[PDB]
């Protein structure tokens, strides 16, 4: 009747199979205490699938004004209607075009804005918050979430959740670009893939996706989820242990200098959110600094748990809708303390 869990990343990543199992914490807490990320599959089967479609967001919210980002060159597209984003999510012939006349790979910036998700989308808020895995950690009032219980000596997360909406990266050149560049968060996070859109028009794009996963260092069991079970892959993540953050900063200072950037010796390339670690940079991190990460493919309905302090980057394989909630576990509270 389905096994409790399996392993990815050759034994280094816990994958829980039943999102609402009351005994998940017993397997989870040992991996979490060691500063590892955790994957939980099957959250899509708990949700009302009609609430998470791109066509519904366009119909209900299409007249709101927003900014977009061109993922290929970081150009900002200012003050457009949110339908201009949603109507091109899966239909390539409807996307905003760059000067070269190609359809753009776009990210929708800060939408819903700030802490407004609950007010703007109360039925979505309920559906997500009631079906989050590890609820004693992840609910606003969970017994193991210290977010509402800490004094001002700790950086507290904003009221969530936050939605992350972007097209898939397409070409061989796109393999070196991030959807979200390398950064870290002082809080813990759970990120849920609630919808994956595989386009039509330039549909037949299956093969660059396989080369991206393979070159991305994905394990053999992860490759079997496509070929054997035909699940929809959304996004390729690289996550690094919080303890390796300074070694990553040293690599990126050296590369910034090799590329003729002019940066003070103390500047923080992870906080700048300006780098994506491509195959060349990931190999250099392993070979020159001794640092190994976790390469994670987030499929429809996968919840990725990212530990406080852990540097991480995201590369969309197809068009994705992700919803994330921040929390403060007792295992990782040291990462948000304002002294020493
Ligand atoms: C509704 C799921 O049905 C089952 O029979 C479960 C499947 C998942 N599992 C556990 C057990 N402990 C912790 C976490 N998961 C084993 C039994
Ligand atoms: Cl830690
Ligand atoms: Cl709603
Ligand atoms: Cl729990
Ligand atoms: Cl970014
Ligand atoms: Mn993050």
Swiss-Prot record:
Species of the source: Homo sapiens
Annotated domain remarks: Leu-Xaa-Xaa-Leu-Leu (LXXLL) motifs are known to mediate the association with nuclear receptors.
UniProt tissue specificity: Ubiquitous. Highly expressed in placenta, skeletal muscle, kidney, heart and liver.
Disulfide bonds: none
Family: Belongs to the JHDM2 histone demethylase family.
Transmembrane segments: none
Miscellaneous comment text of the record: Its gene is located in the 5q region of the genome which is deleted in del(5q) interstitial deletion, a frequent deletion found in myeloid leukemias and myelodysplasias, suggesting that it may be a good candidate for the del(5q) tumor suppressor gene.
Protein origin, superkingdom: Eukaryota
Protein name: Lysine-specific demethylase 3B
Subcellular location as annotated: Nucleus
Record's function text: Histone demethylase that specifically demethylates 'Lys-9' of histone H3, thereby playing a central role in histone code. Demethylation of Lys residue generates formaldehyde and succinate. May have tumor suppressor activity.
Coverage span on the entire protein: 1380 to 1717 of 1761
Disease listed for this protein: Diets-Jongmans syndrome: An autosomal dominant disorder characterized by varying degrees of intellectual disability, developmental delay, short stature, and characteristic facial features such as a wide mouth, a pointed chin, long ears and a low columella.
Residues that hold Fe cation according to the record: 183, 185, 312
Domain spans labelled JmjC: 121-340
Gene that specifies this protein: KDM3B
